[PDB]
Amino acid sequence: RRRKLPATIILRALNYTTEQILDLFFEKVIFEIRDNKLQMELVPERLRGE
Amino acid sequence: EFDAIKIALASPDMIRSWSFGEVKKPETINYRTFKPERDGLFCARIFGPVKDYECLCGKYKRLKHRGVICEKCGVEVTQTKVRRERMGHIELASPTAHIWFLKSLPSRIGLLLDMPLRDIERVLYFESYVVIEGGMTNLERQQILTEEQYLDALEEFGDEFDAKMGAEAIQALLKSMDLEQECEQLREELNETNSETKRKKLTKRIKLLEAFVQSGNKPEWMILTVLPVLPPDLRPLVPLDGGRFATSDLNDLYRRVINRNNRLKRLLDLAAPDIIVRNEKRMLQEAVDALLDNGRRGRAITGSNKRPLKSLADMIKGKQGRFRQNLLGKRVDYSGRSVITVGPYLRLHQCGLPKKMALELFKPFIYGKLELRGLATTIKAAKKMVEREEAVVWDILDEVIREHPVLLNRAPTLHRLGIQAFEPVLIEGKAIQLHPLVCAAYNADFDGDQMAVHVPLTLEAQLEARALMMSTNNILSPANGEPIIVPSQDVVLGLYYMTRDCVNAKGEGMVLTGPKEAERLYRSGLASLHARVKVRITEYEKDANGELVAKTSLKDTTVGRAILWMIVPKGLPYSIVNQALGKKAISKMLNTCYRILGLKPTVIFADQIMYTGFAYAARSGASVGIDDMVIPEKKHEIISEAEAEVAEIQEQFQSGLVTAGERYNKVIDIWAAANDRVSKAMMDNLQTETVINRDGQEEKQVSFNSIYMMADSGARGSAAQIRQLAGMRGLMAKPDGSIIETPITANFREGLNVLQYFISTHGARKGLADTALKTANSGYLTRRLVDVAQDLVVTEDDCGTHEGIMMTPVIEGGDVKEPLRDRVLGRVTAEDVLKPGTADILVPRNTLLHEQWCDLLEENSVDAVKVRSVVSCDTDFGVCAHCYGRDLARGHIINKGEAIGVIAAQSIGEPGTQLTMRTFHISSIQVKNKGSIKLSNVKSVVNSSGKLVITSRNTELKLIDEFGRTKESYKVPYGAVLAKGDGEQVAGGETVANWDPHTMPVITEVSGFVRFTDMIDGQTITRQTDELTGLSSLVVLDSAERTAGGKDLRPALKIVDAQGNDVLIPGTDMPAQYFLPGKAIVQLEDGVQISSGDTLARIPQDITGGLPRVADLFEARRPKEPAILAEISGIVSFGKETKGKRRLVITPVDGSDPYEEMIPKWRQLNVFEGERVERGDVISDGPEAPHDILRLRGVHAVTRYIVNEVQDVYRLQGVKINDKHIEVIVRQMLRKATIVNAGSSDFLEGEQVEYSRVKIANRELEANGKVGATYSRDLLGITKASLATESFISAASFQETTRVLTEAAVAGKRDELRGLKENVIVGRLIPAGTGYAYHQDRMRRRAA
Amino acid sequence: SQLKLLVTRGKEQGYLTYAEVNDHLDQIEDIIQMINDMGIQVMEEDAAEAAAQVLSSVTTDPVRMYMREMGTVELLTREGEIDIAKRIEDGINQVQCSVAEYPEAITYLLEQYDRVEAEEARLSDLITGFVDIDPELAREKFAELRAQYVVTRDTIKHATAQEEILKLSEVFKQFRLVPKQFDYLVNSMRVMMDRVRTQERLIMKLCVEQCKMPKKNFITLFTGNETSDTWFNAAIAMNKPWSEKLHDVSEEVHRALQKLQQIEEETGLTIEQVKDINRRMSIGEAKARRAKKEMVEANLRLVISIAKKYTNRGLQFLDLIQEGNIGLMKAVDKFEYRRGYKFSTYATWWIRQAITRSIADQARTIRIPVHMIETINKLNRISRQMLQEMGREPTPEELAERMLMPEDKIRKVLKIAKEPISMETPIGDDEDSHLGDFIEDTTLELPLDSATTESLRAATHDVLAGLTAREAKVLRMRFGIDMNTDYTLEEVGKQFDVTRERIRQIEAKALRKLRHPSRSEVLRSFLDD
């Protein structure tokens, strides 16, 4: 019942960092430099109704 | 005999004046003998003797030693009751601070010394010094220090500091400060700093100081140095059987404080280190502070009991405390309880009594009679013989009870009809009889419910009970004049079974010489109880001046109705028993009997209707049989169809056409439609299934099914539950409100498998759980209504004013939801009532509108009746009797003395139980019928179609009939397409207005061309071209749409002519250029032509009913979406832009418009910045707050809004309640007020005070040559209007006791007993009722 | 604006649980109780601006405040405690020499010693022993101070006297007299300076504090002669206007010189000797007291440890500690390192008896003797080792053979305990009826029995109506009827003036006529066998 903290404060206290935390909690949308207009990979069902 | 109760701070010499000695020791009693200790918390000398007329050492033990105080034991021999009266005092070793001036909310010692409470806290608990006589070094009296600072001030000088810490410091602070000095100082420091916060703050604080001034109270009296102890008796040390004892927590609290005081004394004579002594002083302040009260201090310092010790103030406040519980709600001698049963034989004016209870309550009466007769010798013999219960005592008891009434009463007394007096009838057995027509008045069934009987002892009490309270005098409900002795549950079924035509039965269609021959023919078994018949009767339709003119006929009717006629009295016409005579109609029958023929005939006829109805429902043999619950033959058909439908929706949902969150709603609506269909089918198959064949062919009559007969009769139950028997039973929603989509397709005549029953259990559980919780607050809104308007009674006879309200029906374009009959029955007209022929004065000035005047107006159709409300009654401290009206249990004009505040409370409350306990929630004016049309506020012009269209705002439609009335009204918004004009006798079924939510136009007043001004693209707006077909247009853009290069401009399609001007709107000094707000959908491009009234740019854009909607509604709480309106009446115009909120000001016709405030555009404007809107005109959004209705449209609107707001919560429920009562609570809601200018007054101008002081003051100052003064009308919610009170005992009894007391303590308030809550406390008579004579004559005694 | 924001939020939402008030900021409890009445209606799952101002100003558990007070307190060193002790001793020696600096102090010493030699006290109770068995040594030693004084009387005429008054003081320092004799001359020494100092308040305050007399003129006049009129009655020729005001009191403060010459006589020597004597005394005395105050500070850690185990036998935790301190300071007067010891072991003896002698004193609503509490604690402990040992339970008979007491002296003590019930106890029914709501009265006259008695004084008035004036009056005479009455038979013999014997005859005649059945049957109604 104590003072509120930003939730990932415990995780950083749990020996965690930016990369693997945002890996564990979200997916991966990979942009790349494919030489021309930032050619991007995508999952067809990953981007449904929108 | 006393009067004018007083209160104030207590001086130490006062407290020494009370005591008869000082407690010193913490011993209490002797543990071997139980005699008191020497000077412990139970003393012989101090608080007196222990038993009747003896010392404690035993030296003197006679009554002849009365008064003389012994010399060895020194206990003043007197009555032993004196221990209840004496008080002890305590001399504290050091000062200590009273908690009530310390830790109470407004901090009576907080703002008495300029300090923050935490500062004086740090002072009190020995933390940091406070300077007094602090030299001209750094401080004089206020600022705190530290021990570093205490020693660096004691550094470099020992003289010139003179400060202490804790109790003594605060004591020298108060004992040094003067009142007059600081008041005059901050007086001068006030009017030069009357900034809006500073002014009010310093003014209120100087008010407190001047209140301290004129009180003669001394601030250092606040800090305690002598502490007074209760007498011993009120904190006894009773002996319990078995060697144990029982004490009150006051005892050990006193003991602990005495222990800490003795310890500090011992410390002081030791000159021990100041750390230990300071902890002792802190501890004693703790002890006393937890003594006077337990809450402000942190931890209620409990005992060996794992409960908190219960201190002093807790024995005054709270539910349990003396005030709220034991000082009004107290047990009674001569009163008994029992279980109630029916016994329908006995008349309404009496009740059966058990013989044992009757011989108990009237024991002393029977003793008195047995001594008056000489049937005994003395009282002892009388008691012995009545305990033997010999024969003579029965006749003595039958004699003494004979005319001696008793009060009956139930646990939940909601309204005054919950207590009625009956005449006893000695019954064997142990139940309590009851006339069944009085259960409904009590609201008690016979499942084992228990009344209580009190005996009126006093002869004035006997007469009060008989003449005011006896049931026969109290038949009409107080919340509305409806008779509340109506036939309740079973006599209506018998009467309905009696008056019921059947097409063919025995003796069909004969002629009968009278009703009597009808009875003789039926009981003999020659005709049926209900066979259609021609009967000869005689009705006494009294028409002349009290003339009962008889006239006979040959009525064609039932044998049953002819029988029932024999119990109708002379007055009524036969057309009242010549119907089916259900539950509604028979109540109407009793109502008409009262209305026509007085009271006594109505009571006699009520008992007759009950007797005959019971007897014929006995004859009926009306049963309920399993065959009588008919299942429709076409039920399974509908079930198959609906299951096909649900399968269809499921098929489509697998087809990907619908959401689950809409599949749900579709199946719900499917099953609901199937449910209503099943109900209609079952009603058809049951309501009239009975076919009968007289003379061959069969004919249709209403069914004789004795479940239908108990629903159509309205005796018990309705069509819906009968559906729940035969048809399908609902859908059985979950507890919250989520309906479970698979219904219970069964019924109750068939079974319910386990899941059907389980689905039923959700709703059953929630409903029962929340009906056991309207019990937890059966009387919460009743309490909080009574405790605000209790102090209001009819006091004078007429105040001779003319104000009131103009009554008009509650119609919203449908049918007349409330005719002018009900809203005016029983009130007093304030002026004449003029027929629309404009010369027909119908009721001059003070004609109480009974049924007859209201009748005459009914067939005369005048609907303009200015009736004197209570809320505008000019009377002081009460209300004009002629202002209130007549709606008593008695039909006549109210009589002075009646506590109409309380009956208003109990009427607005007790149907509240009949409401739903939980707050539940729920375009063109097409003329619906025939008539003419009237546009009120019709400010419009012949528009583009040459027709009418709303250029005004508050045009309200009206179905004008030729009667002289308003048949059906409507609201017409701005720019409505009025397909006709005003004053057209029109046809029925016609839409005479049309308008679009997406088209709120800015249509032109007169002609012009499409010639723009400021409408610049890129700077102000966007050159829109809706090129789906290619149309370009300059729609107005808001500031987030306009750039900054044009935001300081005002777009408008300027009104022009063919010449080059800007044609100014006639009536204003402005040329017409219709300035437009954001989203102003424009079409007409630059240069186009228009004419008068053309479409310029047509911009686009549930009622609750619970009970706690009403308590809120009686609180004037600012709703979420308030609607502010105009304070000025004139042409309006915009202002600054977006300082968080838009700005705009309502310009007068000639004056000044300094009125502007933060108008947020999240709340949408409904008026432009170019209209002449008057004060009280719709600009803001949402629900109007009731406050602004008062401050803008006055008191009469805020009350007509509030009664017409809370009435419709009852109205939406089907409940009925008179409007008179909802005003009397209003009149308490607006009792306080604020001032406009002092003038000849004696208060602050920007101040608040109750109405009546002003109301007596500046009406008197007109009598003087001096000036009158002006005042603003405040308005307080009931619980906020209730705290503001002139008493200080009426407030302690219900509100926060400590808050009232300390304030009324420091204020030196003096209460002179008035109102009804205080005189009950003191136990004298009440000012209101029978004791209105006893209290006026005090005024003659208080007039010399 | 943190708490200002939370109170804005309270006026917004109108109910705020522990989550916010714990997370929007003991003092926690305090602030929640304060936020209650904006009004806000706070829960657990002129006040609005008033409470806003009190919630705009940024614990009082006296135990927490007491720890914080004790924060600057710390354990003192052992031989450092010896140093504080010897400082106390130096203070007591300063006070001893001060009293011996007063010769007539030793004169009253000889007075008490003669009174015990005249047998006004005990020869071993006159003093708590000398600093050295048989009183004739210490008594003759006191007699030495007798002769050692009268050898001193030869020499105030001053060089040989000053060191002769002290030789009976150096012998004085090697003694240890009982404190009552110690404090008497001291509390007389306390009386001595108040008398003399009050004189200068009549002497100097009536010159330096009224007559505009600068401080130099009195100090340059008084101190230096200090006794005669050369310092006071010579100031009235000061060539001053305020020294001219030295006339109206010249006969009055000269009285104050008449009181000083008394005090110089009463002191026997110059008041400035007596001044710096008791000045020196309380100079070290406060330092001596200061030494004790220092030591008591660094031993409360013992007392909080001691009281840690007595707590929950019905006494407030800060009440245990204060009784604990009382012993800790009483021992500072008594603890002696003169043996070489730790005060820590010595203190807990006094501090144990402090808590327990108090705990049996002021820890019930009915008090009981410590020797009875001596009993109850002896049973309850001896109840333990018998209940645990024999099996089920000690029957009071079984206690009779463990403790051979008569078992009706025992069983009465087992009726002694179990202090009274809180009359505000909540009874069942869930009705909130407390226990006291059912305890009835016994002082009330039964309303019927009052109704009976009103006929009695009527009914006996009936037969006493139909009496003879003598019998009707004599019976009202003989019995306590209709007055402050019951005059004895000799007393009725006087008023009626007949005879102490004759009255009983007519008294016997009185009811013998009233003993008639069928004549006084009214009171026959007031008989029920």
Ligand SMILES: [Mg+2]
């Ligand atoms: Mg019931």
Ligand SMILES: [Zn+2]
């Ligand atoms: Zn006595």
Ligand SMILES: [Zn+2]
């Ligand atoms: Zn009135």
